[PDB]
Design a protein around this ligand. Structure first.
Ligand SMILES: [O]
Ligand SMILES: [Zn+2]
Ligand SMILES: [Zn+2]
Length: 219
């Protein structure tokens, strides 16, 4: 009965359900408590079609269940797979945007402002990830999460803010769709933005749907 399960649960139990949700712009990362039925109702989408899509994906076995992994292992994975990867992706994308805005400034379809908006995202992310790595994650590792509800809600507010900056980047790039005039840098950059959105959503999902709720529950 997938329509009745929360998005976050579905994304964690069905391999690549996250990619299905991305296609429909369903926020499983910050909106993970919503039922699929609700999220579908909000978007005016046929849930039965989405349920069939999920059933086909569930045919693949699941590769690794983060729902049961120890919190310290989740944290080290976040740092290596997501935090450090964002520290490399974003500056690359900023450089590519700088060049595109420079060279194609006079094309009517150029994504004007993209360099600044990627830089804003990068700046918010850098300070956010440092708070996590230096202050919050160490306390969660020592089993102190159930006394950290204040801090954790602050981090979830910051995840929501990063979500808003993603929407701005989407808006500036026509939902990350290159015009017919785009060169290979411009196309590659848009592919990299999509990759960044994928990773960021999986990163935030892992924190909002697994790490933080388990830590608050006393792990
Ligand atoms: O994060
Ligand atoms: Zn993080
Ligand atoms: Zn975070």
């Amino acid at each position: 009965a997938y329509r009745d399960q929360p998005l976050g649960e579905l994304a964690l139990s069905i391999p690549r359900a996250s990619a299905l949700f991305r296609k429909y712009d369903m926020d499983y990362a910050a909106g993970g408590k919503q039922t699929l039925a609700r999220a579908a109702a909000r978007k005016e989408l046929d849930v039965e079609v989405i349920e069939a899509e999920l059933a086909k994906l569930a045919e693949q076995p699941i590769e690794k269940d983060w729902r049961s992994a120890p919190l310290a292992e989740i944290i080290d994975h976040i740092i290596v797979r997501y935090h450090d990867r964002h520290r490399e992706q974003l500056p690359e994308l900023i450089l590519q945007a700088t060049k595109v805005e420079r060279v194609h400034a006079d094309k009517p379809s150029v994504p004007k402002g993209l360099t600044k908006y990627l830089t804003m995202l990068h700046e918010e992310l850098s300070s956010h990830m440092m708070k996590e790595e230096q202050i919050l994650f160490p306390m969660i590792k020592q089993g102190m999460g159930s006394q950290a509800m204040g801090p954790i809600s602050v981090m979830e507010s910051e995840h929501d803010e990063a979500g808003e900056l993603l929407e701005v980047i989407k808006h500036t790039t026509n939902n990350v769709t290159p015009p017919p005039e785009a060169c290979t840098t411009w196309k590659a950059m848009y592919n990299g933005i999509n990759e960044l959105i994928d990773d960021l959503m999986d990163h935030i999902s892992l924190e909002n749907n697994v790490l933080f709720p388990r830590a608050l529950a006393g792990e």
